[PDB]
Amino acid sequence: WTATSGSCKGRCFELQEVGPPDCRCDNLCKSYSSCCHDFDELCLKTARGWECTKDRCGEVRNEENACHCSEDCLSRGDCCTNYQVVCKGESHWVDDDCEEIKVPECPAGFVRPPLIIFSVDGFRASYMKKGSKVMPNIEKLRSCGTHAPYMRPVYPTKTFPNLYTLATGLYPESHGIVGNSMYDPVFDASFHLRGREKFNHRWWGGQPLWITATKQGVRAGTFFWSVSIPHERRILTILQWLSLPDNERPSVYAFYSEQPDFSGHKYGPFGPEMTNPLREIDKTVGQLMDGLKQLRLHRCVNVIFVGDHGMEDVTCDRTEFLSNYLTNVDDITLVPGTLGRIRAKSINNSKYDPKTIIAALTCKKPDQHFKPYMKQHLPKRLHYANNRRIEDIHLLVDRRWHVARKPLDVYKKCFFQGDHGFDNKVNSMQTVFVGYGPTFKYRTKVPPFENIELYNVMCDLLGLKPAPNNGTHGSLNHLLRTNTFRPTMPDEVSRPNYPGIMYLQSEFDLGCTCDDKVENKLEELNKRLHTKGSTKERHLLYGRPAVLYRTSYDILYHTDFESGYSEIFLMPLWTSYTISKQAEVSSIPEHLTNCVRPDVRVSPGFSQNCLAYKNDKQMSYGFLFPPYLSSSPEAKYDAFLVTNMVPMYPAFKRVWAYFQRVLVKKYASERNGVNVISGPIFDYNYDGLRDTEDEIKQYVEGSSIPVPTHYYSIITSCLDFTQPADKCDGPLSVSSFILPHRPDNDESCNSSEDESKWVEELMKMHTARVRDIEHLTGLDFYRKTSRSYSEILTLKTYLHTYESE
Numbered sequence: 001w002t003a004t005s006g007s008c009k010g011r012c013f014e015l016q017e018v019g020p021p022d023c024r025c026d027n028l029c030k031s032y033s034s035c036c037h038d039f040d041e042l043c044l045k046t047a048r049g050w051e052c053t054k055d056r057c058g059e060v061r062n063e064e065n066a067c068h069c070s071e072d073c074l075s076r077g078d079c080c081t082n083y084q085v086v087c088k089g090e091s092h093w094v095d096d097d098c099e100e101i102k103v104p105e106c107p108a109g110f111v112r113p114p115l116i117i118f119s120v121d122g123f124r125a126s127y128m129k130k131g132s133k134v135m136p137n138i139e140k141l142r143s144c145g146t147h148a149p150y151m152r153p154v155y156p157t158k159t160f161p162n163l164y165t166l167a168t169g170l171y172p173e174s175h176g177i178v179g180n181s182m183y184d185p186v187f188d189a190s191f192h193l194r195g196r197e198k199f200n201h202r203w204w205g206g207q208p209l210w211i212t213a214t215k216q217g218v219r220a221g222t223f224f225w226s227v228s229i230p231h232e233r234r235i236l237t238i239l240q241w242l243s244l245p246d247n248e249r250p251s252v253y254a255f256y257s258e259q260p261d262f263s264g265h266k267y268g269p270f271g272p273e274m275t276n277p278l279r280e281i282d283k284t285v286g287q288l289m290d291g292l293k294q295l296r297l298h299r300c301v302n303v304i305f306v307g308d309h310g311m312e313d314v315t316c317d318r319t320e321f322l323s324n325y326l327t328n329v330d331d332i333t334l335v336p337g338t339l340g341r342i343r344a345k346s347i348n349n350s351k352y353d354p355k356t357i358i359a360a361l362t363c364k365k366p367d368q369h370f371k372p373y374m375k376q377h378l379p380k381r382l383h384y385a386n387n388r389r390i391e392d393i394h395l396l397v398d399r400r401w402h403v404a405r406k407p408l409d410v411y412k413k414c415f416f417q418g419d420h421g422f423d424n425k426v427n428s429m430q431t432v433f434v435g436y437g438p439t440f441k442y443r444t445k446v447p448p449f450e451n452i453e454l455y456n457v458m459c460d461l462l463g464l465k466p467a468p469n470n471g472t473h474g475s476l477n478h479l480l481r482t483n484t485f486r487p488t489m490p491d492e493v494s495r496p497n498y499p500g501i502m503y504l505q506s507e508f509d510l511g512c513t514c515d516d517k518v519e520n521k522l523e524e525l526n527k528r529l530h531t532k533g534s535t536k537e538r539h540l541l542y543g544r545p546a547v548l549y550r551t552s553y554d555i556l557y558h559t560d561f562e563s564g565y566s567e568i569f570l571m572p573l574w575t576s577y578t579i580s581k582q583a584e585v586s587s588i589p590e591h592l593t594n595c596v597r598p599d600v601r602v603s604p605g606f607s608q609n610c611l612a613y614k615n616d617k618q619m620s621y622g623f624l625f626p627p628y629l630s631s632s633p634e635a636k637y638d639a640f641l642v643t644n645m646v647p648m649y650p651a652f653k654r655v656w657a658y659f660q661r662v663l664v665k666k667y668a669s670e671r672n673g674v675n676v677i678s679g680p681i682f683d684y685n686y687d688g689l690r691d692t693e694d695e696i697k698q699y700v701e702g703s704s705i706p707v708p709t710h711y712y713s714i715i716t717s718c719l720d721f722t723q724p725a726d727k728c729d730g731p732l733s734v735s736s737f738i739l740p741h742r743p744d745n746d747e748s749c750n751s752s753e754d755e756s757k758w759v760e761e762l763m764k765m766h767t768a769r770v771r772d773i774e775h776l777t778g779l780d781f782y783r784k785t786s787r788s789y790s791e792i793l794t795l796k797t798y799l800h801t802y803e804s805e
């Protein structure tokens, strides 16, 4: 019940919300059906429209009008946004030359520059160039302020996950909003776009910017607007709030626009009907900026123009139906559309088997337009697994397509020409970022970045300390004139040992053999120096990685590579090597095919053994430094050390061998040398964080050798590719991957063909940021460069996406 029989007299768009069953006058009361009787009358005035006209100038104040052109309006803070243009001979903001804002020029009483977030739904990144002619206000913001060519949303590229990621800096798996539609098994409840359940606080985790602000004594405007409050009224409300007394005035504000998303669903991303929505968005920006200029706040306020996701061409005749694949289609529930999520219709059914469902959806039709995954097998870059609201079975759907359960669900629900929600690497899903104001830079282009990073910058822009989040604080310092946050490198927790020769061959009983019993005063001083670290400046270009947890490990030096060997996990955490442009690929000699050699620096008891692999019929083994890339026949022996060995499924060895034999050399040619850091990853609980020893679910049969869930590589070179990787004077260039360690290649439908037809495609799919690898290993890379830490942070957040221009 709401006793709706009070009043909004003098309370229009109040900032503090009152407690039921009292009647409300806040910008959300409509969406709760709880506004006072007179709300429409007093708070949503529309009389006479939104603009001043030549004959409204200096009129008698009539309180019934939407906005005012009277003389006293500037003091009351409620003029139509164009009042000065029409009645005082002033110019529109857009028609002024832009001048650098070197310092905040604010009215007395302002303790900090205010922040206005102008967010636009479905604003595809390419609209900035393609609609440039019809968006003059937005185009002035872009070219005078700081801008990116695009900004990467989170997966799934839906509305609520992306808006709440903007507000919190969290992956949807961590903030809880994992889709536009959700079921929570612990709650036994569903979350929909329509309805009242979405208004319950229990869905929304993390700490959004407005709460972070309130708790630290910064006042916030209310971010959410009811759908029936027109755009023009939202702008006037923000402007009115900005006229309040210093003690009452918020410092952070939000505007939301349903366009162009709303139209893009109907007409598609570039439908001719799309020009008008872009014109109107630009008109609304113009109004805000004209309003700010009237109050002399246009060189004081920081404005962020930001989208949640883009928009793709999608029609009904591009729908795949599960009913064309499954027999038992009635025992399942599907969350449909641009992504697929499958669970059992009833948990009282013990005959339901996810394994057989996946099998029935795997490579069944030659042109198939979705791919099924157990959630833990999704590319790690999506960070989409660690939440009870994310179903075990997931369908990644091809751009331009839909997935539905039965055909009946599509025609008894063509209505639409556009949609979104696909993989966040897809070009048509990219969205926009522009920052404009005293704290942003002047006329600056920055590289593309991810939307998880903004929460930190907004906190910076407001002088707040950010709640723990997924951004990397300092990685967007290059956007800002000042207010920068100065990050330090995490302290190393474990220091390494540097073992020498401590064990005799015969102390080892590992069941390993090698054909290496052959025989010089010159060439023996040489091999000693290599094991002491003479070539280490060649293979360890950026310092050794830091270990940021408590453990026991050894640094091992070799002619061609260096590794940090973990005595706990019985394998290296990392292996580092440089492959120059001129280097040569050789093969493994016939006598050395099954050669594994004891490492006399490491005790038998901290070594793997060959017997375990022989006994394990499923598991085989591979090497981290590839024998193929040894610099000499003699150095090749180092590659067969038991300490370079890691466990690998035969099916995965096909992938690994192609990468090591073909691709590394190809990258060295194209990039003028590469440095490579490879290693194992253990993430059995799929939380995206390094597993402790007691979390490993799988060992090589009859031993304490743990099985990695993934294998990573970080491939670095010089951004100026005229300089070789090992003699680089400037910025670096990186690409990385995290390949799932799987006993089959079911993920690749073309895997019965030659590795050259499918391997590289798979690697591209599982591209990663160095930062993703750091979470998963508890390491910290690039500790010794000549670059600034901020720049290195940007590098660590980079993702190579493999999309075209």
Ligand SMILES: *[C@@H]1O[C@H](CO)[C@@H](O[C@@H]2O[C@H](CO)[C@@H](O[C@@H]3O[C@H](CO[C@H]4O[C@H](CO)[C@@H](O)[C@H](O[C@H]5O[C@H](CO)[C@@H](O)[C@H](O)[C@@H]5O[C@H]5O[C@H](CO)[C@@H](O)[C@H](O)[C@@H]5O)[C@@H]4O)[C@@H](O)[C@H](O[C@H]4O[C@H](CO)[C@@H](O)[C@H](O)[C@@H]4O[C@H]4O[C@H](CO)[C@@H](O)[C@H](O)[C@@H]4O)[C@@H]3O)[C@H](O)[C@H]2NC(C)=O)[C@H](O)[C@H]1NC(C)=O
Pocket: 170, 171, 173, 174, 175, 176, 202, 203, 204, 205, 206, 383, 386, 387, 388, 468, 469, 470, 687, 688, 689, 775
């Ligand atoms: C992205 O950034 C985020 C944020 O920084 C990272 O997530 C953090 O990771 C931490 C490590 O996993 C985690 O710390 C744990 O906190 C537990 C208490 O957490 C509560 O309080 C916080 C802070 O206010 C709050 O945010 C949490 O809210 C969660 O839960 C509610 C509902 O339950 C949700 O509404 C909300 O969305 C959020 O859920 C998300 O996180 C949880 C995990 O906390 C997931 O399960 C969800 O799927 C979802 O993603 C909480 O209300 C605390 O209990 C933990 O402590 C245990 O572990 C430590 C290890 O040191 C041990 O010493 C303790 O003894 C304790 O173990 C005991 O409990 C065990 C389990 O019951 C039991 O096995 C043992 O026997 C012990 O009894 C732990 O410290 C932190 O909560 C989250 N924060 C957030 C916001 O998600 C994330 O890692 C980043 N991602 C990447 C890739 O880097």
Ligand SMILES: O=C(OCc1ccc(OC(F)(F)F)cc1)N1C[C@@H]2CN(C(=O)c3ccc4[nH]c(=O)oc4n3)C[C@H]2C1
Pocket: 117, 119, 121, 159, 163, 164, 166, 167, 168, 180, 193, 209, 223, 224, 225, 226, 254, 255, 256, 258, 261, 262
């Ligand atoms: O006022 C709203 O949001 C303010 C807001 C602004 C910025 C924020 O973040 C930042 F400031 F920190 F940056 C956070 C919040 N709302 C009301 C709208 C109801 N919606 C749909 O119903 C919808 C809209 C488009 C859709 N497309 C689709 O497929 O489903 C959709 N549902 C979308 C909701 C957004």
Ligand SMILES: [Ca+2]
Pocket: 121, 122, 158, 159, 261, 308, 309
């Ligand atoms: Ca949207």
Ligand SMILES: [Ca+2]
Pocket: 682, 683, 684, 685, 686, 687, 688, 689, 690, 691
């Ligand atoms: Ca883990």
Ligand SMILES: [Cl-]
Pocket: 156, 158, 178, 179, 180, 181, 335
């Ligand atoms: Cl969804």
Ligand code: NA
Pocket: 613, 614, 615, 616, 617, 618, 619, 620
């Ligand atoms: Na085997």
Ligand code: NA
Pocket: 745, 746, 747, 748, 749, 750, 751, 752
């Ligand atoms: Na296959």
Ligand SMILES: [Zn+2]
Pocket: 122, 159, 261, 262, 265, 420
């Ligand atoms: Zn939409």
